[PDB]
Design a binder for these strands. Structure first.
Length: 129
RNA sequence: GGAUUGAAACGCCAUGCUCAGGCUGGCGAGUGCGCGCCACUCAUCAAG
């Protein structure tokens, strides 16, 4: 196993047709609008949730690709793990949970304060117009 | 390469505007009103 060797930046263009891409819990579930520009807004956490769900569906409990932060799409059919003192448990979590390895996580541990950062980072998505 | 009160963080699941109801019943464009009163095609020119 070896980590990636290059820095990456990506731009993703997605559209919505007659739908609510991301409701605003502070505007009666209306789609988010940017007050400064009037552009539609989609938080990063929404896209991260979608990515987590997609990977959970696609790999469905494979060896290295379990998803920790679930949203009631879980299935209890079958799980397996790599079978690897805080560093030990941190590496074990990273080595077999895709979302922890990708976005990071924070455990209730003291020595490192829990901070697992992860390489991937996403910003708020806003409408073109 | 230890720490940007940070690191992780869906507003989300779903819900017929429907059932229906004449713009109708009936009402002359009509009564009447000269295109009419006049005005040369005409004054000439072998047939070869």
């Amino acid at each position: 196993m070896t980590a990636i060797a290059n820095r990456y930046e990506f731009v993703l263009l997605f559209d919505v047709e007659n739908g609510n891409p991301n409701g605003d819990p502070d505007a009666g579930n209306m789609p988010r609008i940017d007050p400064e520009t009037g552009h539609g807004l989609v938080t990063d956490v929404c896209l991260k949730r979608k990515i987590r769900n997609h990977v959970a569906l696609t790999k469905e409990g494979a060896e290295r690709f379990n998803i920790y932060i679930q949203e009631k799409a879980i299935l209890n059919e079958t799980h397996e793990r790599a079978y690897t003192d805080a560093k030990r448990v941190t590496d074990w979590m990273c080595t077999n949970f895709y979302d922890i390895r990708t976005f990071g996580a924070v455990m209730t541990t003291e020595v490192n304060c829990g901070q697992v950062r992860g390489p991937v980072q996403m910003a708020f998505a806003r409408s073109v117009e």
